[PDB]
Amino acid sequence: SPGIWQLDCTHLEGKVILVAVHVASGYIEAEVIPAETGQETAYFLLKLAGRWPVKTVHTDNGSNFTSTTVKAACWWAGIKQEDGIPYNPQSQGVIESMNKELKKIIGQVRDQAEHLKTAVQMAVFIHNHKRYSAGERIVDIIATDI
Amino acid sequence: SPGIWQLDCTHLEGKVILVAVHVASGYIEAEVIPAETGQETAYFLLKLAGRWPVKTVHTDNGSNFTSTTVKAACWWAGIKQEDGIPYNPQSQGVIESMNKELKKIIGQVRDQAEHLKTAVQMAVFIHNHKRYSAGERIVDIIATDI
Ligand SMILES: NCCCCCC(=O)N[C@H]1Cc2ccccc2/C1=C\c1ccc2c(c1C(=O)O)OCO2
Ligand SMILES: NCCCCCC(=O)N[C@H]1Cc2ccccc2/C1=C\c1ccc2c(c1C(=O)O)OCO2
Numbered sequence: 001s002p003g004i005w006q007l008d009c010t011h012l013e014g015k016v017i018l019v020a021v022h023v024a025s026g027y028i029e030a031e032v033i034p035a036e037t038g039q040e041t042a043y044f045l046l047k048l049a050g051r052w053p054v055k056t057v058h059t060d061n062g063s064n065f066t067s068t069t070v071k072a073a074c075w076w077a078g079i080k081q082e083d084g085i086p087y088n089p090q091s092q093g094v095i096e097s098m099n100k101e102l103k104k105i106i107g108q109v110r111d112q113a114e115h116l117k118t119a120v121q122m123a124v125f126i127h128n129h130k131r132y133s134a135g136e137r138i139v140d141i142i143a144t145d146i
Numbered sequence: 147s148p149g150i151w152q153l154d155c156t157h158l159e160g161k162v163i164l165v166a167v168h169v170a171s172g173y174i175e176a177e178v179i180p181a182e183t184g185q186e187t188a189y190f191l192l193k194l195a196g197r198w199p200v201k202t203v204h205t206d207n208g209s210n211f212t213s214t215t216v217k218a219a220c221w222w223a224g225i226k227q228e229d230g231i232p233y234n235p236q237s238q239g240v241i242e243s244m245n246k247e248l249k250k251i252i253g254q255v256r257d258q259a260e261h262l263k264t265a266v267q268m269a270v271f272i273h274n275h276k277r278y279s280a281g282e283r284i285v286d287i288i289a290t291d292i
């Protein structure tokens with residue numbers, strides 16, 4: 001549980017927002033990319049795994065699950081790559097709710113930033129600090145595990 | 147102490163590697179940028195502060211300390227922007243040692259990656275996982291503070 005992350009891909013302004021959610025805490029990292037490719041996903045996962053102890057990733061779709069580049073990154077970083085099938089159906093709705101929430105925050109900050117990527121990082125900040133906070137929960141969870 | 151970070155800028159392959167070090171743990175985040183500008187530094191700090199509880203940043207030079215864009219980002223993210231003058235002289239040497247270590251790791255992985263940015267993120271991963279590890283220390287420090 002402390003090492004479980006879920007990938008999530010959402011769209012805004014003709015661009016793609018790639019999100020990793022730490023399932024147990026709701027803590028997120030996110031980036032804007034031109035389109036979701038195996039290459040982009042692989043690089044994103046490498047970044048994530050260097051920063052937090054990522055044991056398992058539930059991939060966001062079958063293309064990323066199949067991607068040899070994503071598989072290479074998961075091998076390199078010691079990540080167990082799994083499907084993201086919502087066997088528990090309240091998963092769908094929670095990811096949906098998070099995308100809606102993130103887009104709302106992005107709209108609330110959008111005019112403070114020239115570029116979407118900046119607004120997305122502002123949204124990450126607000127989400128992870130919002131009150132415990134998600135940032136507090138992830139640290140506590142991992143510390144307890146260690 | 148749990149909230150103190152130090153910026154560090156080093157060079158490789160005609161490119162710039164921007165590093166943030168969590169002083170109490172040795173944990174790092176890093177990115178490759180074409181050149182160190184206020185814009186790049188500001189964006190990097192926004193990303194960092196959304197991901198960890200960044201209270202104080204010791205800036206890497208006077209240009210970034212002066213930059214209105216960096217000041218704007220620090221204001222936005224609630225970061226106290228400070229100078230990075232090594233009042234304690236063992237700071238210089240520790241940062242110097244870290245840059246040497248990072249470049250060594252980059253060389254050890256460089257052939258596994260087409261692009262420098264990938265090698266740098268591999269180096270971040272190896273550095274933060276190397277055995278406690280820096281990743282374990284930062285989590286414990288912050289958890290104790292919370
Ligand atoms: N629509 C009006 C926009 C006017 C811009 C106002 C303004 O200075 N924003 C600051 C606030 C702020 C808070 C935190 C971080 C950046 C920024 C800002 C700019 C900025 C800086 C670097 C970047 C950026 C942008 C960006 O602006 O996105 O993009 C990638 O690297
Ligand atoms: N001697 C040359 C080696 C040829 C490449 C070998 C190879 O497949 N590396 C994997 C291993 C690996 C481990 C972790 C993450 C990426 C990669 C790799 C590629 C890669 C993927 C996405 C990217 C990249 C690269 C990149 O290659 O940098 O760049 C930005 O997004």
Ligand SMILES: [Cl-]
Nearest residue numbers: 135197198199
């Ligand atoms: Cl946080």
Ligand SMILES: [Cl-]
Nearest residue numbers: 051052053281
């Ligand atoms: Cl780690």
